[PDB]
Amino acid sequence: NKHSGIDFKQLNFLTKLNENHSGEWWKGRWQGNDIVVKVLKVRDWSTRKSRDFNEECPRLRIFSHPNVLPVLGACQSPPAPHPTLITHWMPYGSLYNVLHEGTNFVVDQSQAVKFALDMARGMAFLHTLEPLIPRHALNSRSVMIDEDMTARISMADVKFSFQSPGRMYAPAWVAPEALQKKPEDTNRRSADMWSFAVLLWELVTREVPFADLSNMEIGMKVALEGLRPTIPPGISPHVSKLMKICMNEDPAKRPKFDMIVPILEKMQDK
Amino acid sequence: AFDTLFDHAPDKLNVVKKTLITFVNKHLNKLNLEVTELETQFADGVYLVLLMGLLEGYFVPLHSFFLTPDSFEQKVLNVSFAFELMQDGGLEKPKPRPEDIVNCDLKSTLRVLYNLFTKYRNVE
Protein backbone atom coordinates (compact mmCIF):
# COMPACT_ATOMS: atom_id res chain seq x y z
CA ASN A 1 0.00 0.00 0.00
CA LYS A 2 1.06 3.57 -0.74
CA HIS A 3 0.15 4.84 2.82
CA SER A 4 -0.47 2.98 6.04
CA GLY A 5 -2.01 6.02 7.78
CA ILE A 6 -1.67 6.99 11.42
CA ASP A 7 -1.10 4.25 14.02
CA PHE A 8 -4.14 4.20 16.36
CA LYS A 9 -1.83 3.01 19.21
CA GLN A 10 0.00 6.37 19.04
CA LEU A 11 -3.12 8.45 19.79
CA ASN A 12 -3.65 9.73 23.33
CA PHE A 13 -7.37 10.43 23.98
CA LEU A 14 -7.70 13.29 26.56
CA THR A 15 -11.23 14.68 26.70
CA LYS A 16 -14.47 13.95 24.91
CA LEU A 17 -15.69 17.08 23.04
CA ASN A 18 -18.86 15.85 21.28
CA GLU A 19 -20.88 13.03 19.90
CA ASN A 20 -23.61 12.89 17.31
CA HIS A 21 -25.02 10.73 14.44
CA SER A 22 -21.67 10.81 12.59
CA GLY A 23 -19.34 9.71 15.50
CA GLU A 24 -17.45 11.02 18.53
CA TRP A 25 -14.85 13.81 18.78
CA TRP A 26 -12.05 13.70 21.30
CA LYS A 27 -9.33 16.17 22.14
CA GLY A 28 -5.97 14.40 22.06
CA ARG A 29 -2.23 14.36 21.53
CA TRP A 30 -0.25 12.65 18.83
CA GLN A 31 3.47 13.07 18.06
CA GLY A 32 3.72 16.38 19.87
CA ASN A 33 0.55 17.81 18.26
CA ASP A 34 -2.71 18.90 19.88
CA ILE A 35 -5.35 17.11 17.81
CA VAL A 36 -9.02 16.33 17.51
CA VAL A 37 -9.76 12.64 16.91
CA LYS A 38 -13.02 11.90 15.03
CA VAL A 39 -14.09 8.25 15.46
CA LEU A 40 -16.67 7.60 12.78
CA LYS A 41 -19.90 5.74 13.44
CA VAL A 42 -20.67 3.14 10.81
CA ARG A 43 -23.10 0.15 10.68
CA ASP A 44 -22.14 -3.00 8.69
CA TRP A 45 -18.51 -2.14 8.14
CA SER A 46 -17.00 -4.20 5.34
CA THR A 47 -13.82 -4.69 3.35
CA ARG A 48 -15.38 -2.66 0.53
CA LYS A 49 -16.20 0.29 2.83
CA SER A 50 -12.74 0.11 4.37
CA ARG A 51 -11.13 0.18 0.95
CA ASP A 52 -13.38 3.18 0.11
CA PHE A 53 -12.41 5.10 3.28
CA ASN A 54 -8.74 4.62 2.45
CA GLU A 55 -9.23 5.85 -1.14
CA GLU A 56 -11.45 8.84 -0.08
CA CYS A 57 -9.18 10.18 2.76
CA PRO A 58 -6.24 11.40 0.65
CA ARG A 59 -8.45 14.05 -1.10
CA LEU A 60 -8.95 15.63 2.32
CA ARG A 61 -5.25 16.25 2.82
CA ILE A 62 -5.15 19.82 1.49
CA PHE A 63 -2.11 21.72 2.93
CA SER A 64 -1.86 24.57 0.37
CA HIS A 65 -4.55 27.08 1.39
CA PRO A 66 -4.79 29.05 4.65
CA ASN A 67 -8.62 28.85 4.59
CA VAL A 68 -8.81 25.07 4.27
CA LEU A 69 -8.16 22.88 7.29
CA PRO A 70 -6.85 19.50 6.17
CA VAL A 71 -7.19 16.08 7.65
CA LEU A 72 -3.80 15.56 9.26
CA GLY A 73 -4.11 11.80 8.88
CA ALA A 74 -6.44 8.89 9.15
CA CYS A 75 -6.44 5.46 10.91
CA GLN A 76 -7.34 2.64 8.61
CA SER A 77 -9.77 0.11 10.06
CA PRO A 78 -8.64 -2.61 10.36
CA PRO A 79 -6.36 -2.44 12.19
CA ALA A 80 -7.82 0.49 14.00
CA PRO A 81 -11.05 -0.46 15.79
CA HIS A 82 -13.07 2.05 13.82
CA PRO A 83 -12.25 4.44 10.90
CA THR A 84 -10.86 7.52 12.45
CA LEU A 85 -9.71 11.05 11.23
CA ILE A 86 -7.21 13.25 12.97
CA THR A 87 -7.04 17.07 12.63
CA HIS A 88 -5.08 19.81 14.40
CA TRP A 89 -6.99 21.24 17.35
CA MET A 90 -8.58 24.64 16.44
CA PRO A 91 -8.82 26.52 19.77
CA TYR A 92 -12.12 28.40 19.11
CA GLY A 93 -14.00 25.39 17.73
CA SER A 94 -16.48 25.78 14.92
CA LEU A 95 -17.93 28.96 13.49
CA TYR A 96 -21.20 27.75 14.98
CA ASN A 97 -19.57 27.55 18.44
CA VAL A 98 -18.13 31.03 18.04
CA LEU A 99 -21.28 32.70 16.85
CA HIS A 100 -23.95 30.88 18.86
CA GLU A 101 -22.25 29.33 21.93
CA GLY A 102 -19.75 32.03 22.92
CA THR A 103 -19.31 32.67 26.61
CA ASN A 104 -17.24 35.88 26.58
CA PHE A 105 -16.97 38.87 24.16
CA VAL A 106 -19.35 38.72 21.15
CA VAL A 107 -17.43 38.76 17.89
CA ASP A 108 -17.60 42.15 16.26
CA GLN A 109 -18.90 42.93 12.74
CA SER A 110 -15.34 43.47 11.43
CA GLN A 111 -14.42 40.00 12.57
CA ALA A 112 -17.65 38.67 10.95
CA VAL A 113 -16.69 40.22 7.63
CA LYS A 114 -13.22 38.70 7.90
CA PHE A 115 -14.88 35.29 8.55
CA ALA A 116 -16.97 35.73 5.40
CA LEU A 117 -13.91 36.63 3.30
CA ASP A 118 -11.89 33.69 4.72
CA MET A 119 -14.77 31.26 3.93
CA ALA A 120 -15.20 32.68 0.38
CA ARG A 121 -11.47 32.32 -0.31
CA GLY A 122 -11.44 28.76 0.94
CA MET A 123 -14.53 27.87 -1.14
CA ALA A 124 -13.05 29.57 -4.28
CA PHE A 125 -10.03 27.31 -3.83
CA LEU A 126 -12.04 24.14 -3.26
CA HIS A 127 -14.07 25.05 -6.38
CA THR A 128 -10.87 24.85 -8.53
CA LEU A 129 -10.52 21.12 -7.76
CA GLU A 130 -11.37 18.62 -10.47
CA PRO A 131 -13.46 16.77 -9.71
CA LEU A 132 -14.93 18.58 -6.67
CA ILE A 133 -14.44 16.90 -3.29
CA PRO A 134 -17.64 14.78 -3.15
CA ARG A 135 -20.35 15.30 -0.45
CA HIS A 136 -18.78 18.46 1.02
CA ALA A 137 -21.67 20.62 2.55
CA LEU A 138 -20.88 24.15 3.73
CA ASN A 139 -22.41 25.22 7.04
CA SER A 140 -21.35 26.88 10.27
CA ARG A 141 -20.53 23.53 11.89
CA SER A 142 -18.13 22.69 9.07
CA VAL A 143 -15.94 25.78 9.37
CA MET A 144 -13.34 26.00 12.12
CA ILE A 145 -11.81 29.00 13.77
CA ASP A 146 -8.03 28.94 14.36
CA GLU A 147 -5.95 30.71 17.03
CA ASP A 148 -5.67 34.04 15.17
CA MET A 149 -9.40 33.88 14.33
CA THR A 150 -8.85 32.70 10.74
CA ALA A 151 -11.87 30.74 9.44
CA ARG A 152 -10.97 27.46 7.70
CA ILE A 153 -13.21 25.10 5.80
CA SER A 154 -13.04 21.77 7.64
CA MET A 155 -12.08 18.81 5.41
CA ALA A 156 -12.80 16.31 8.31
CA ASP A 157 -16.47 17.24 8.00
CA VAL A 158 -16.89 15.82 4.54
CA LYS A 159 -19.20 12.75 4.45
CA PHE A 160 -17.88 9.50 3.06
CA SER A 161 -19.71 7.26 0.50
CA PHE A 162 -20.70 4.88 3.29
CA GLN A 163 -22.15 7.47 5.70
CA SER A 164 -25.88 8.27 6.14
CA PRO A 165 -26.75 8.84 2.37
CA GLY A 166 -30.53 9.63 2.90
CA ARG A 167 -30.17 11.55 6.27
CA MET A 168 -29.46 15.37 6.02
CA TYR A 169 -28.76 16.93 9.47
CA ALA A 170 -28.15 20.58 8.55
CA PRO A 171 -30.78 21.31 5.84
CA ALA A 172 -31.13 25.04 6.73
CA TRP A 173 -27.93 25.72 4.72
CA VAL A 174 -28.85 23.56 1.74
CA ALA A 175 -30.14 24.99 -1.52
CA PRO A 176 -33.77 24.05 -2.34
CA GLU A 177 -32.73 22.15 -5.47
CA ALA A 178 -30.26 20.12 -3.43
CA LEU A 179 -33.05 19.09 -1.01
CA GLN A 180 -34.87 17.53 -3.97
CA LYS A 181 -32.40 16.41 -6.69
CA LYS A 182 -29.52 13.97 -6.68
CA PRO A 183 -26.05 15.74 -6.61
CA GLU A 184 -25.43 14.38 -10.15
CA ASP A 185 -28.46 16.45 -11.32
CA THR A 186 -27.49 19.75 -9.64
CA ASN A 187 -24.77 22.31 -10.14
CA ARG A 188 -22.86 21.70 -6.89
CA ARG A 189 -20.93 25.03 -7.13
CA SER A 190 -24.12 27.00 -7.32
CA ALA A 191 -25.65 25.03 -4.43
CA ASP A 192 -22.58 25.90 -2.32
CA MET A 193 -23.21 29.60 -2.96
CA TRP A 194 -26.69 29.25 -1.35
CA SER A 195 -25.01 27.76 1.73
CA PHE A 196 -22.69 30.83 1.80
CA ALA A 197 -25.74 33.15 1.66
CA VAL A 198 -27.17 31.43 4.69
CA LEU A 199 -23.86 31.87 6.46
CA LEU A 200 -24.02 35.61 5.60
CA TRP A 201 -27.50 35.58 7.10
CA GLU A 202 -26.16 33.97 10.28
CA LEU A 203 -23.34 36.47 10.51
CA VAL A 204 -25.83 39.33 10.18
CA THR A 205 -28.42 38.08 12.61
CA ARG A 206 -26.33 36.09 15.02
CA GLU A 207 -29.21 33.61 15.08
CA VAL A 208 -29.40 29.94 13.98
CA PRO A 209 -31.39 29.76 10.77
CA PHE A 210 -34.89 28.26 11.34
CA ALA A 211 -33.88 27.61 14.95
CA ASP A 212 -37.54 27.03 15.98
CA LEU A 213 -38.04 24.10 13.46
CA SER A 214 -36.85 20.49 13.41
CA ASN A 215 -34.60 19.40 10.54
CA MET A 216 -37.42 17.48 8.81
CA GLU A 217 -39.70 20.48 9.00
CA ILE A 218 -36.97 22.70 7.56
CA GLY A 219 -36.23 20.51 4.58
CA MET A 220 -39.89 19.85 3.76
CA LYS A 221 -40.89 23.49 4.03
CA VAL A 222 -37.89 24.83 2.14
CA ALA A 223 -38.28 22.20 -0.61
CA LEU A 224 -42.05 22.14 -0.99
CA GLU A 225 -43.52 25.24 0.63
CA GLY A 226 -41.16 28.07 -0.29
CA LEU A 227 -39.81 28.69 3.18
CA ARG A 228 -36.79 31.14 3.07
CA PRO A 229 -34.73 33.12 5.52
CA THR A 230 -36.13 36.63 6.07
CA ILE A 231 -33.69 39.31 4.82
CA PRO A 232 -32.78 41.25 7.98
CA PRO A 233 -33.79 44.92 8.32
CA GLY A 234 -31.28 47.69 8.92
CA ILE A 235 -28.40 46.32 6.86
CA SER A 236 -26.27 48.09 4.29
CA PRO A 237 -27.39 47.97 0.66
CA HIS A 238 -24.35 46.06 -0.52
CA VAL A 239 -24.73 43.36 2.21
CA SER A 240 -28.43 43.07 1.26
CA LYS A 241 -27.63 42.86 -2.40
CA LEU A 242 -24.93 40.25 -1.87
CA MET A 243 -27.14 38.03 0.27
CA LYS A 244 -29.99 38.22 -2.18
CA ILE A 245 -27.92 37.38 -5.27
CA CYS A 246 -26.07 34.55 -3.42
CA MET A 247 -29.44 33.21 -2.37
CA ASN A 248 -31.07 33.55 -5.79
CA GLU A 249 -33.89 31.09 -6.61
CA ASP A 250 -32.29 30.35 -9.94
CA PRO A 251 -28.94 28.53 -9.32
CA ALA A 252 -27.50 29.83 -12.60
CA LYS A 253 -27.83 33.49 -11.43
CA ARG A 254 -25.85 32.96 -8.23
CA PRO A 255 -22.23 34.27 -8.45
CA LYS A 256 -19.00 32.31 -8.41
CA PHE A 257 -17.00 32.52 -5.18
CA ASP A 258 -14.13 34.15 -7.06
CA MET A 259 -16.59 36.94 -8.08
CA ILE A 260 -17.58 37.70 -4.48
CA VAL A 261 -14.10 37.56 -2.93
CA PRO A 262 -13.30 41.01 -4.35
CA ILE A 263 -16.54 42.50 -2.85
CA LEU A 264 -15.67 41.05 0.56
CA GLU A 265 -12.13 42.37 0.32
CA LYS A 266 -13.56 45.95 -0.01
CA MET A 267 -15.75 45.40 2.99
CA GLN A 268 -12.73 44.66 5.26
CA ASP A 269 -10.94 46.88 7.78
CA LYS A 270 -7.37 47.71 6.47
CA ALA B 1 -46.26 -9.64 25.03
CA PHE B 2 -47.42 -8.03 21.75
CA ASP B 3 -49.09 -11.10 20.08
CA THR B 4 -51.06 -12.07 23.19
CA LEU B 5 -52.34 -8.46 23.46
CA PHE B 6 -53.32 -8.25 19.77
CA ASP B 7 -55.18 -11.64 19.57
CA HIS B 8 -56.77 -11.86 23.12
CA ALA B 9 -57.07 -8.34 24.70
CA PRO B 10 -59.45 -6.21 22.55
CA ASP B 11 -59.84 -3.19 24.89
CA LYS B 12 -56.15 -3.02 25.62
CA LEU B 13 -55.73 -3.08 21.79
CA ASN B 14 -58.02 -0.02 21.29
CA VAL B 15 -55.93 1.89 23.86
CA VAL B 16 -52.82 0.89 21.88
CA LYS B 17 -54.45 2.15 18.62
CA LYS B 18 -55.45 5.42 20.22
CA THR B 19 -52.08 6.05 21.84
CA LEU B 20 -50.40 5.31 18.49
CA ILE B 21 -52.61 7.70 16.56
CA THR B 22 -51.82 10.40 19.12
CA PHE B 23 -48.05 9.63 18.91
CA VAL B 24 -47.82 9.68 15.11
CA ASN B 25 -49.88 12.81 14.80
CA LYS B 26 -47.82 14.69 17.39
CA HIS B 27 -44.94 14.47 14.82
CA LEU B 28 -46.68 14.31 11.50
CA ASN B 29 -48.84 17.30 12.26
CA LYS B 30 -45.59 19.44 12.17
CA LEU B 31 -45.67 18.77 8.43
CA ASN B 32 -49.44 19.43 8.21
CA LEU B 33 -50.10 15.71 7.75
CA GLU B 34 -52.79 13.90 9.70
CA VAL B 35 -53.27 10.16 10.36
CA THR B 36 -56.93 9.08 10.87
CA GLU B 37 -56.39 5.27 10.51
CA LEU B 38 -53.50 2.97 11.09
CA GLU B 39 -54.79 0.25 8.78
CA THR B 40 -53.73 1.77 5.48
CA GLN B 41 -52.00 5.11 5.96
CA PHE B 42 -48.53 3.57 6.63
CA ALA B 43 -48.68 0.97 3.91
CA ASP B 44 -46.96 3.07 1.22
CA GLY B 45 -43.92 3.75 3.42
CA VAL B 46 -44.04 7.55 3.05
CA TYR B 47 -45.17 8.41 6.55
CA LEU B 48 -42.78 5.91 8.08
CA VAL B 49 -39.89 7.68 6.27
CA LEU B 50 -41.12 11.12 7.36
CA LEU B 51 -41.69 9.91 10.90
CA MET B 52 -38.21 8.54 11.27
CA GLY B 53 -36.74 11.95 10.26
CA LEU B 54 -39.08 13.62 12.81
CA LEU B 55 -38.05 11.29 15.62
CA GLU B 56 -34.29 11.17 14.91
CA GLY B 57 -33.64 14.81 13.80
CA TYR B 58 -32.94 14.69 10.06
CA PHE B 59 -34.49 15.58 6.78
CA VAL B 60 -34.67 12.86 4.11
CA PRO B 61 -33.78 14.26 0.66
CA LEU B 62 -36.74 13.77 -1.70
CA HIS B 63 -34.61 11.85 -4.25
CA SER B 64 -33.89 9.18 -1.54
CA PHE B 65 -37.39 7.67 -1.57
CA PHE B 66 -40.66 7.87 -3.35
CA LEU B 67 -42.80 10.65 -1.99
CA THR B 68 -45.76 9.58 -4.14
CA PRO B 69 -45.32 5.82 -4.83
CA ASP B 70 -47.10 4.65 -7.95
CA SER B 71 -46.54 0.89 -7.54
CA PHE B 72 -46.21 -1.95 -5.07
CA GLU B 73 -42.51 -2.10 -5.76
CA GLN B 74 -41.99 1.57 -4.92
CA LYS B 75 -43.89 1.16 -1.66
CA VAL B 76 -41.79 -1.85 -0.74
CA LEU B 77 -38.63 0.19 -1.43
CA ASN B 78 -39.99 3.02 0.85
CA VAL B 79 -40.74 0.65 3.69
CA SER B 80 -37.41 -1.16 3.34
CA PHE B 81 -35.69 2.29 3.51
CA ALA B 82 -37.65 3.14 6.63
CA PHE B 83 -36.56 -0.10 8.24
CA GLU B 84 -32.88 0.72 7.44
CA LEU B 85 -33.40 4.11 9.12
CA MET B 86 -34.81 2.40 12.15
CA GLN B 87 -31.67 0.14 12.25
CA ASP B 88 -29.40 3.16 11.74
CA GLY B 89 -30.97 4.59 14.91
CA GLY B 90 -30.26 1.44 16.96
CA LEU B 91 -33.45 -0.68 16.61
CA GLU B 92 -33.07 -4.33 15.71
CA LYS B 93 -34.29 -5.38 12.24
CA PRO B 94 -38.08 -5.30 12.39
CA LYS B 95 -39.88 -8.67 12.44
CA PRO B 96 -42.37 -8.08 9.60
CA ARG B 97 -41.17 -8.20 6.04
CA PRO B 98 -41.62 -4.83 4.30
CA GLU B 99 -44.20 -6.48 2.07
CA ASP B 100 -46.32 -7.20 5.25
CA ILE B 101 -46.66 -3.42 5.78
CA VAL B 102 -47.44 -2.64 2.11
CA ASN B 103 -50.11 -5.38 2.23
CA CYS B 104 -51.77 -3.63 5.24
CA ASP B 105 -51.33 -6.43 7.72
CA LEU B 106 -52.58 -4.75 10.88
CA LYS B 107 -50.52 -6.73 13.41
CA SER B 108 -47.33 -5.99 11.42
CA THR B 109 -48.16 -2.25 11.13
CA LEU B 110 -48.97 -1.92 14.85
CA ARG B 111 -45.82 -3.85 15.91
CA VAL B 112 -43.58 -1.48 13.93
CA LEU B 113 -45.43 1.59 15.26
CA TYR B 114 -45.44 0.23 18.81
CA ASN B 115 -41.62 -0.29 18.76
CA LEU B 116 -41.23 3.36 17.60
CA PHE B 117 -43.51 4.62 20.36
CA THR B 118 -41.63 2.70 23.07
CA LYS B 119 -38.25 4.13 21.97
CA TYR B 120 -39.34 7.63 21.00
CA ARG B 121 -42.33 8.45 23.20
CA ASN B 122 -40.43 11.31 24.98
CA VAL B 123 -39.23 13.08 21.83
CA GLU B 124 -40.63 16.66 21.69
Author numbering:
A (entry chain A): 183 to 452
B (entry chain B): 249 to 372
Paper text:
Integrin-linked kinase (ILK) is one of the few evolutionarily conserved proteins found in FAs to critically control the FA assembly and integrin–actin connection. However, sequence analysis suggested that despite containing kinase-like domain, ILK is a pseudokinase lacking several key active site residues. Our results reveal that by recruiting FA adaptors PINCH and Parvin into a heterotrimeric complex (IPP), ILK is able to trigger F-actin filament bundling via two WASP-Homology-2 actin-binding motifs, one from PINCH and the other from Parvin.
On the other hand, another major puzzle still remains unresolved, i.e., what is the role of Mg-ATP bound to the ILK pseudoactive site? To circumvent this problem, we carefully analyzed the ATP-binding residues in the pseudokinase domain of ILK structure and designed L207W mutation that does not affect the structural integrity but sterically occludes ATP binding to ILK. To validate our design, we first examined the propensity of the substitution by characterizing the recombinant ILK KLD L207W in complex with α-Parvin CH2. Consistently, CD denaturation studies revealed that there was little change in the thermal melting temperature of the mutant ILK (L207W) complex (Tm = 53.9 °C) versus that of the wild-type complex (Tm = 54.2 °C), demonstrating that the L207W substitution has little effect on the stability of ILK/Parvin complex. To further prove this, we solved the crystal structure of the ILK (L207W)/α-Parvin CH2 complex, which showed that the mutant complex exhibits the same interface as the WT complex, yet the substitution of L207 by more bulky side chain of tryptophan in the pseudokinase domain precluded the binding of ATP as well as Mg2+ as expected. The mutation clearly abolished the ATP binding as well as Mg2+ binding to ILK. We note here that Mg2+, while interacting with D339 at the pseudoactive site, is predominantly chelated to ATP 13,14 explaining why the loss of ATP binding also led to the loss of Mg2+ binding. Next, we examined the ability of IPP L207W mutant in affecting the F-actin bundle formation. Strikingly, as compared with WT IPP, loss of Mg-ATP in IPP L207W led to dramatically impaired F-actin bundling with notable decrease in size of the formed F-actin bundles. Consequently, the mutation further reduced cell spreading and migration. It is important to note that like WT IPP, IPP L207W binds potently to F-actin. Another major finding of this study was that the IPP WH2-mediated F-actin bundling is highly sensitized to Mg-ATP bound to the pseudoactive site of ILK.
